[PDB]
Amino acid sequence: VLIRKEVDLLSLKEANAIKDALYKLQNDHSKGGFEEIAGYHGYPNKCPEKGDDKYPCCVHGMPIFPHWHRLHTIQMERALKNHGSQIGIPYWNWTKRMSSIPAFFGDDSNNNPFYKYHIRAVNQYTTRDVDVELFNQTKFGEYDYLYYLTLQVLEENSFCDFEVQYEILHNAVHAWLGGAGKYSMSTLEYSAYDPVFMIHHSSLDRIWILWQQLQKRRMKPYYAADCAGDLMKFPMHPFSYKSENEDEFTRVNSVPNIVFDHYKFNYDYDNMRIRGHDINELEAIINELRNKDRIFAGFVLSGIRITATVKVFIHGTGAEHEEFAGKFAILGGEKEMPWAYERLLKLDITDAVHHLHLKDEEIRFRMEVTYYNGVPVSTKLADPLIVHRPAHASHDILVIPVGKGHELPPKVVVKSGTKIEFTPIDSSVDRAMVELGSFTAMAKCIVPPFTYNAFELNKVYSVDHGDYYITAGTHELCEQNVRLNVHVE
Amino acid sequence: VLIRKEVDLLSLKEANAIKDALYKLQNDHSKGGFEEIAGYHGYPNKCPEKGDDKYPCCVHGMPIFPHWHRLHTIQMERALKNHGSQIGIPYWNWTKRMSSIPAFFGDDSNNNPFYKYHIRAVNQYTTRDVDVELFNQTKFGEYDYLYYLTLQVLEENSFCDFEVQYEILHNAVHAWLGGAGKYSMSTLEYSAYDPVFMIHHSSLDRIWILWQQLQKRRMKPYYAADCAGDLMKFPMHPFSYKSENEDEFTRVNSVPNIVFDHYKFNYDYDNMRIRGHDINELEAIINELRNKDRIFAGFVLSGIRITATVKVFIHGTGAEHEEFAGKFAILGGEKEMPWAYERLLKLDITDAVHHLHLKDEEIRFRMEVTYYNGVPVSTKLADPLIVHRPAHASHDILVIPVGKGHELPPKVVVKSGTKIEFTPIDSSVDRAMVELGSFTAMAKCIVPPFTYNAFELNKVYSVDHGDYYITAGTHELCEQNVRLNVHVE
Ligand SMILES: OC[C@H]1O[C@H](O)[C@@H](O)[C@@H](O)[C@@H]1O
Ligand SMILES: OC[C@H]1O[C@H](O)[C@@H](O)[C@@H](O)[C@@H]1O
Ligand SMILES: [Cu+2]
Ligand SMILES: [Cu+2]
Ligand SMILES: [Cu+2]
Ligand SMILES: [Cu+2]
Ligand SMILES: [O-]
Ligand SMILES: [O-]
């Protein structure tokens, strides 16, 4: 019964009514008030439930990220209803062309409750530092940044791969709203205190529902996950804590497998259009995207304990011409749960690769990783792999540069029928990669003095199912980073 | 139709007839003769089939070891039939009490073809150097060594765990017959040229068939494997090589999933008794073994590139009294395929543990690893884990000492409902182990500054299914050996 409307479609009467509910909610000091419910997410760190060894509860970098933030938005939405709201939490279609922030939350006049919040526990107001690139975005060919990343989400047809693209898209808006401020959307510890937090996650949830609709029409799964399955079964925190959640309906219904189905929670959206496009038009756009070759930088990411922007530059094999290829954001915090996607975040680099006339095996990378506050990030990112998606292909080609001391993702999960190809980044790798057949043989670099289950350099191989424990053809190289686990379907 | 008889039950007429067939076979220089078929196994290294990067074909340390050696014995058996034999390959029940080697192959008189073989390609006679401990075995309580290891095989009720005990049992006879000689049963490269090789593997195959019968009566699998399933589907080498196998029936039927069923190959045994015990008596003996607590040293082994004997000594936590606890053999070769059981070889140490009055968490280990030729082995074995099997228990308790610089198995596979317990071997480990949730988090030692999915020290936990990526509670300790993957059912 609670309809979520786009912020610019709210009537004056509706905007004022929900603003009045938020004011009442923000002035509610109980476990049902704004400060306590926002506190589910990061500061003050509400988990184990009792213990004094506390850490932020929100799930990121993991397959239940969407469920966690879906339920958090539901929690805030029911709290606003308990304080008089008659509508759902409004959303912001941040895929649209834009020259300013919507007034509903960007206009401070008349003590707008959605403009900022005074965090009582730390005696700080939330801040924003809006990156004007929002109004002037880079393009992937014809498509503006945020809109293209949203199309990339909708192209995915399996849940755990969807989730990576979904979360990285959502990270961009966090970074672009929050900027350098600690008590901002940039920070896992404090982002949930900005009233725009709930609007952004109401926007993101709409994309998840749209994806679920696409999956239904594809006859692919939309109410179950293809990974982390044991974990989909456990109630989420702190929603399940009696000391922390006075909303019994959400406390009882906090299991991700339940949260898959949003209809159980009595909300819907005014419309599902992106850039004026209904689902039929989006299906046609997604199909158009299959008509040309695409090349991606495939990042296999793990946690870095601080929010940062990754800028990606490419160059060919000689000492010559470097081009900026794109960027994305990673959220993080010093007390974050350890996370590792083990799946590819695909940054489309097609136009830079073509401009530099590089063949797949020639693409080399350089990253600048900078925290939200300008501090350089010391945690090293592995270089991305090269993902080649031919025009109308059913399977991607994963191109993997290897060399002594060149870090690989420890593990990457790929669809059955994915093709892979190893190529040397320097002359240290001068014989075929080998498949050792076990975790232990790879960990101990038990590599035989002969060629064995070989992946010849610069040859393409299809992988079908199971685990591949691939290393360089010598023990010493295997001990110098040249090994990884390819896990298939 | 080909009956395999115990060597001491052969009539004089039968022994002479099969000896005449072996003589003819040994003098056959073709691809169907003794030297070429024995050459399947190690020297001269017959695989890839064409390539000049050759290595020995026999599968060891892997789940298809039994299939490979079953088919090899079938290959030799059909070759002997093609040279006039009317019986199967005889076997030697080496579980029996014994004061000498059976005359059928241990008596050199009258140019006995089974006594030794002249390897034409290297111009060497096979040698034996029989360890007289065969006639004077250590005991596990009341049970002599080889007989007890055979009972341990028959106790297993799942295939990949069966296979570890099965192969380690078979290794003991290799080491005890071969001794220090290079051209002996001690060596993967040359053992197959000793005519006793086929007799030993005819003995071992009988135990596999007996186990398959037990599994049938248990309504547990006996024609399929519970691991390495993709690999059970591919034809074995060099049996599938046209240039190497003129026996079309074995060439076509070389897939392990087919070889599971020995009836397809038209042989059987005169009887299945061990130590005079039929299968009903063995079931009662196996049940008796469940009546008392047992403690095992659980070795999780990987390849060491040479045949060796492992001697195991235990002592408690202080500087005091050490006791010899048992020993076993590992076969190997410099060109062996890389292998890793990732499952527990259980060496029963109950009596030494009780003699020293040690609690589970106090048991400490020292190994002496010595190659068949007396050279000390430089490849380090991880210390075994401690396996506690309470009297009538359905699940084992795995006790895992941990500490800075103390090597663990990289991965261990255990049955669902196995209990595990971590205990510090020194004070470096002074907070709970943690479960990180991914291969990558473990590989990169992404350990959070708080307690997380904790395994408290000296507490017992049951594990149910899936993968556990367990590390010490600090990044630096995780980087100093204190991590492992526990893979469940
Ligand atoms: O002038 C620099 C800047 O100007 C405008 O804002 C846009 O056209 C941007 O793309 C460009 O980067
Ligand atoms: O005398 C040493 C030696 O003697 C006999 O052979 C047996 O009783 C052995 O167990 C013992 O080790
Ligand atoms: Cu969050
Ligand atoms: Cu968020
Ligand atoms: Cu062998
Ligand atoms: Cu053998
Ligand atoms: O978030
Ligand atoms: O063997």
Q: Which residues contact B432 (CB under 8 A, 6 or more apart)?
A: B451, B454, B455, B456, B457, B473
Give the DSSP per-residue string, B369-389: EEETTSPBP-SPPPPPEEEEE
Question: What is the number of helices (H) and of strands (E) in chain A?
Answer: 13, 20
CB of A380 within 8 Å of a chain B CB? The answer is no
Based on the number of CB atoms within 10 Å of its own CB, is B405 exposed (0-12), middle (13-18) or buried (19 or more)? Answer: exposed
CB of B379 within 8 Å of a chain A CB? The answer is no
Instruction: List residues bridging with A312 in a β-sheet.
Output: A326, A367
Nearest to B26 by CA among B127, B129, B116: B116
How many residues are listed for chain A in this entry? 489
Instruction: List residues bridging with A468 in a β-sheet.
Output: A486
B136 Cα to the center of ligand 2, angstroms? 7
Q: Tell me which H or E stretch contains A214.
A: helix A196-218
Experimentally, how was this structure solved? Answer: X-ray
Nearest to A46 by CA among A56, A38, A31: A56
Q: Which stretches does DSSP call E strand in A63-160?
A: 118-119, 124-125, 139-140, 143-144
Instruction: Give yes or no for a contact between A407 and A481, defined as CB atoms under 8 angstroms apart.
Output: yes
Give the DSSP per-residue string, A97-127: --SS--HHHH--GGG-TTT--EETTTTEE--
Both tokens of A373, joined, read: 């506050």
Task: Calculate ∠ Cα B479-B484-B489, nearest 5°.
Answer: 160
* DSSP structural state of residue B423: E
Instruction: Give yes or no for a contact between A446 and A403, defined as CB atoms under 8 angstroms apart.
Output: no
Tell me how far apart the alpha carbons of residues B35 and B254 are, in angstroms, rounded to a whole number.
20
Question: What SS3 class is residue A310?
Answer: strand
Q: Which residues surround ligand 5, an ion (CB under 5 A)?
A: B 58
* DSSP structural state of residue B324: E
Q: Tell me which H or E stretch contains A148.
A: helix A145-155
Q: Which amino acid residue places its CA nearest to atom 1 of ligand 7?
A: A188
Strands B454-455 and B433-435: antiparallel
For A402, half-sphere exposure in the C-beta direction (CA atoms, 13 angstrom radius) is 32
B329 Cα to the center of ligand 4, angstroms? 57
CB of B439 within 8 Å of a chain A CB? The answer is yes
**Residue showing tokens 């009537």:** A11
Q: Residue A60's Cα: distance from chain center in Å?
A: 8
For B195, half-sphere exposure in the C-beta direction (CA atoms, 13 angstrom radius) is 25
Neighbours of B252 (CB within 10 A): 13
Cross-chain residue pair B302–A440, CB shorter than 8 Å: yes
Cross-chain residue pair A411–B439, CB shorter than 8 Å: yes
Give the DSSP per-residue string, B94-112: TTS--SS--HHHH--GGG-
* B302, B337, B444 member nearest A410 (Cβ): B444
Strands A267-269 and A2-4: parallel
For B239, half-sphere exposure in the C-beta direction (CA atoms, 13 angstrom radius) is 24
B139: left (phi over 0), alpha (psi -120 to 50) or beta: beta
Tell me how far apart the alpha carbons of residues A251 and A253 are, in angstroms, rounded to a whole number.
6
**Residue showing tokens 């699940």:** B395
Tell me how far apart the alpha carbons of residues A80 and A25 are, in angstroms, rounded to a whole number.
6
Q: Which residues contact B476 (CB under 8 A, 6 or more apart)?
A: none
Tell me how far apart the alpha carbons of residues B176 and B106 are, in angstroms, rounded to a whole number.
14
**Residue showing tokens 């929010």:** A307
Q: Residue A36's Cα: distance from chain center in Å?
A: 25
Q: Residue A96's Cα: distance from chain center in Å?
A: 20
Tell me how far apart the alpha carbons of residues A131 and A173 are, in angstroms, rounded to a whole number.
10
* DSSP structural state of residue B297: E
Q: To the nearest whole angstrom, how far is the Cα of B428 from the nearest Cα of chain A?
A: 21
Instruction: List residues bridging with A140 in a β-sheet.
Output: A143
Identify residue A43 by its one-letter amino acid code. Answer: Y
Both tokens of B412, joined, read: 């261990």
* DSSP structural state of residue A42: B
CB of B450 within 8 Å of a chain A CB? The answer is yes
**Residue showing tokens 């196995």:** B418
Give the DSSP per-residue string, A366-432: EEEEEETTSPBP-SPPPPPEEEEE-TT-SS-EEEEEE-TT----SEEE--TT-EEEEEESSTT--S-
Tell me how far apart the alpha carbons of residues A193 and A124 are, in angstroms, rounded to a whole number.
10
* A62, A303, A440 member nearest B411 (Cβ): A440
Tell me how far apart the alpha carbons of residues B292 and B355 are, in angstroms, rounded to a whole number.
16
- Using a CB-CB cut-off of 8 Å, the residues of chain A touching B444 are 302, 340, 410
Q: Nearest bound ligand to CA B145? A: 2
> What is the rounded end-to-end Cα distance, in angstroms, of chain B?
40
**Residue showing tokens 């299906």:** A283
A487 is in an annotated binding site: no
Q: Domains of chain B, with CATH numbers?
A: 2-286 (1.10.1280.10), 291-487 (2.60.310.10)
**Residue showing tokens 């093609």:** B82
Query: Alpha helix locations (H) across B108-218?
Result: 145-155, 159-178, 196-218
- The values of phi and psi at residue B77, to 5°, are -65, -45
Q: Tell me which H or E stretch contains A138.
A: none
**Header resolution in angstroms:** 2.0
A104 Cα to the center of ligand 4, angstroms? 19
Neighbours of A342 (CB within 10 A): 23
* A62, A335, A485 member nearest B449 (Cβ): A335
Nearest to A199 by CA among A185, A181, A187: A185
Task: Calculate ∠ Cα B25-B30-B31, nearest 5°.
Answer: 100
Instruction: Give yes or no for a contact between B232 and B225, defined as CB atoms under 8 angstroms apart.
Output: yes
B69 is in an annotated binding site: yes
Max distance between CA atoms of chain B, in angstroms, equals: 77
Q: Nearest bound ligand to CA A41? A: 3
Tell me how far apart the alpha carbons of residues A83 and A77 are, in angstroms, rounded to a whole number.
10
Tell me how far apart the alpha carbons of residues B27 and A386 are, in angstroms, rounded to a whole number.
59
Tell me how far apart the alpha carbons of residues A409 and A403 are, in angstroms, rounded to a whole number.
13
Instruction: Give yes or no for a contact between A401 and A472, defined as CB atoms under 8 angstroms apart.
Output: no
CB of B416 within 8 Å of a chain A CB? The answer is no
Nearest to B372 by CA among B196, B173, B181: B181
B277 is in an annotated binding site: no
Minimum CA–CA partner of B450 in chain A: A53
Tell me how far apart the alpha carbons of residues B215 and B203 are, in angstroms, rounded to a whole number.
19
Q: Nearest bound ligand to CA B40? A: 5
Tell me how far apart the alpha carbons of residues B77 and B205 are, in angstroms, rounded to a whole number.
13
Tell me how far apart the alpha carbons of residues A10 and A4 are, in angstroms, rounded to a whole number.
10
Sheet holding A411-413, edge to edge: A411-413, A483-487, A467-471, A433-435, A454-455
B357 is in an annotated binding site: no
How many residues are listed for chain B in this entry? 489
